[PDB]
Amino acid sequence: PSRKAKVKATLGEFDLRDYRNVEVLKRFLSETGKILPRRRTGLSAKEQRILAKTIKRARILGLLPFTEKLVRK
Template sequence: MSSNFRNDREFEMDDERGGPPAGRGHSGGGRGGPSGRRFRRRKVCRFCQDKVDLIDYKDVKLLQSYVPERSKIMPRRISGSCAPHQRMLAEAIKRARTIAFLPYAAD
């Protein structure tokens, strides 16, 4: 249970949250993380940049970078991938799980 909590934190750490849009820069201060950094880095879909049209379920190295720690599929708001590529990625990860390339859950 506690480890699960930690994982959720980990997801949010390097996250440019869905919160209020830009404008509110540093001035807000109030609820920022302990670090206070609230800048928004524009994330671009890595697959679009690399011009990937097909995500192969056999490409374990690539897929592993999208299933952190608890081997959950990394949400789009963190990885920054676009919707079509996230769908492909999710499908590939699920296929990889079926044939034991990736774990369903980290033990």
């Protein structure tokens, strides 16, 4: 499935290699701190591969979560 919406389709021009930008990056994470699959992010192998590394960098800096509690349920 995952035909609802995609993240690359939402945002405009943005830098994938910028780890200090939380506003952009946090859109690539789920309800939990998990990094979204390509079928969600809408990105490509290279793009995704870069995104992962920058998100991990942002996590280490303390800007992004490694994990989050799941609500609802």
